[PDB]
Structure formats: structure tokens, C-alpha cells
């Protein structure tokens, strides 16, 4: 994984000192320094003419170097391209696939990727629309017992649980070509507006625990498949979600973290990860809040 503790890992009290010394304005200025980082990588596949319409946004390409490639394609429309990047996590390579909100013409590509990448958990942090702006397609069967066929992948909705800030859908993916079935847990977090932060850092961290528990529960019933994490572009809330997850993973296990290093490295894998200085400052603030709440400081 690129997410090694070194070289300036910080303990949770050094983090308190750090945030206290920089303040919100300093953390905002730190975010801008990450954006300045020389964008290593290229975006050619994203901009190939056969692929333009497979991007939801003109200004959110994805990196050639880390993109998820589609293997078992069918149809001249299905290239090997999907706007989705492998992302390392704490002590794990390809912990996540950060992807955009699937478009109608990429629903089939999305499920192909989920299938091929052995994905067990999907985290969605977007509503379908926001401000009447379309933000993500309805790429899964929404009602219990309904099914959609995406070529040789039939997805069936096995049940939905509605909770506080998220709904948990259990999907069966049926590869009807290889007669293989796999359960996939789809999580949709509903209280995270685009370009913004969640209303409760505590709800996001509890949701993160729910997702980790689900990923852990699914992996024990099968090296570890990535978690698909998408928002609308799959960079703003996605990068924030994933950075927070890595930082809490390193904090839990090593007693250290480094937000800067985490987001800097994440943006070499899912380009443009973390979209606003507000979301950047939220990683710091949620971690400190988790740490107070836990009596670590």
C-alpha cells in the first residue's frame, strides 16, 4: 500500500497540537497545498472519444494508472473503461474502488466491475438528485424482490433496512453465464450533501463502523476485495470517506495518523480526492471528535 505510516506519522495528541496551531484557516491552506501537488499520471482513457460519455462530469476524469479495467465486455459500447480507480487503504492494496455515480449507459459497466473485482460491499454517499440536479443513476433494483439484468449479471434486491442516516440493501448478483451467485451489501448514506460535510461526524463514523463490520463479515464468509465507494463524481465525499477510514484504521492499529500524507497519496490514486477545504478540515475535525468522544485527549 502507498499508505505507510512513515514518514511523519502523528499521535492523537500531536494531532491536537497540530490542529490547534494551524486552526481552520491553516487547515484550509493545507488543503490548497495538496491541490498544488504535481498531478502525476495521465487521463487519456477517460478522454478517449469512446469514453467521454462514460464520465458523468467533464471535469472529473480518472487516472489511467489506477483505473479499474473491464475484462469481460460485450457490445461495441462497452470499452474496458469505467470511471473508477483502485485506491490503497491502511496496510492494504486496493482497499477501495472510488467510482462515480453510475450513469444509465454505465450501469452495466458498474456491475461488471463489481462482479470482476469480487466486490462485496458498495458504499454510496449521494442522493439520486440534489437541487434537482441529477447526481447518480438508479443503478440497482430498488424494491425488494425486483431484479435488473445487466447482460450476464442479474442483480436482485433481497431486502432493504432503513436506518438513521443510511439504508442497507442486500443484493444478490447472479452471473448467469457461470451460474455463480454472490451477495453484495449496498449501503446508501443519505445525510452527506455534495460539496459539503455530513451533519454529524458521529453518524459518519458509526456508518463507517457498520461498513467495516459488513466488509469483515462478508470476507469471513469466503486477497480482501475492495469496497466500492462512490458519490456523484466519486471524488469529494468518496475521498473524504476513504481518507477518514484510512486515518482511523492507522489510528486504531498504530496509534498514529497523518491526514496530509493520506490525502496526498490518495490523490495519486483517485485523482481530485477530497473536493473542498471544508471536507479536508472535516477529516481532522471528525478524528479529533472521535478522539474526544473516546477519551483519547
Amino acid at each position: 500500500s502507498v499508505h505507510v505510516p512513515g514518514p511523519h506519522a502523528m499521535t492523537i495528541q500531536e494531532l491536537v497540537d497540530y490542529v490547534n496551531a494551524r486552526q481552520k484557516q491553516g487547515i484550509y491552506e493545507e488543503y490548497e497545498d495538496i491541490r498544488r501537488e504535481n498531478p502525476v499520471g495521465t487521463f487519456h482513457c477517460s478522454m478517449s472519444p469512446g469514453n467521454l460519455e462514460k464520465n458523468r462530469y467533464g471535469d472529473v476524469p480518472c487516472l489511467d494508472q489506477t483505473r479499474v479495467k473491464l475484462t469481460k465486455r460485450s457490445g461495441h459500447t462497452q470499452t474496458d473503461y469505467i470511471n473508477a480507480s483502485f485506491m490503497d487503504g491502511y496496510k492494504q492494496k486496493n482497499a477501495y474502488i472510488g467510482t462515480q455515480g453510475p450513469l444509465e449507459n454505465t450501469y452495466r459497466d458498474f456491475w461488471l466491475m463489481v462482479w470482476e473485482q469480487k466486490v462485496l460491499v458498495i458504499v454510496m454517499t449521494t442522493r439520486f438528485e440534489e437541487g434537482g440536479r441529477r447526481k447518480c443513476g438508479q443503478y440497482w433494483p430498488l424494491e425488494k424482490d425486483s431484479r435488473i439484468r445487466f447482460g450476464f449479471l442479474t442483480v436482485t434486491n433481497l431486502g432493504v433496512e432503513n436506518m438513521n442516516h443510511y439504508k442497507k440493501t442486500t443484493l444478490e448478483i447472479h452471473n448467469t453465464e457461470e451460474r455463480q451467485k454472490r451477495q453484495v451489501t449496498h449501503f446508501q448514506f443519505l445525510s452527506w450533501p455534495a460539496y459539503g460535510v455530513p451533519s454529524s461526524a458521529a453518524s459518519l463514523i458509526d456508518f463507517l463502523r457498520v461498513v467495516r463490520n459488513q466488509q469483515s463479515l462478508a470476507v469471513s464468509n469466503m486477497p480482501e476485495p475492495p469496497i466500492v465507494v462512490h458519490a456523484s463524481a466519486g471524488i469529494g465525499r468518496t475521498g473524504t470517506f476513504c481518507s477518514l477510514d484510512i486515518c482511523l484504521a492507522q489510528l486504531e492499529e498504530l496509534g498514529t495518523l497523518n491526514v496530509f500524507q493520506t490525502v496526498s497519496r490518495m490523490r495519486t490514486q483517485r485523482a481530485f480526492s477530497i473536493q473542498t477545504p471544508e471536507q479536508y478540515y472535516f477529516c481532522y475535525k471528525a478524528i479529533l471528535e472521535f478522539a474526544e468522544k473516546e477519551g483519547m485527549v
Partner: peptide, 7 residues
């Protein structure tokens, strides 16, 4: 077209 940034 559709832009993500600049709101």
C-alpha cells in the same frame, strides 16, 4: 457538458 466543481 456537466461540471462537478465551481458548484
Amino acid at each position: 457538458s456537466q461540471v462537478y466543481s465551481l458548484d
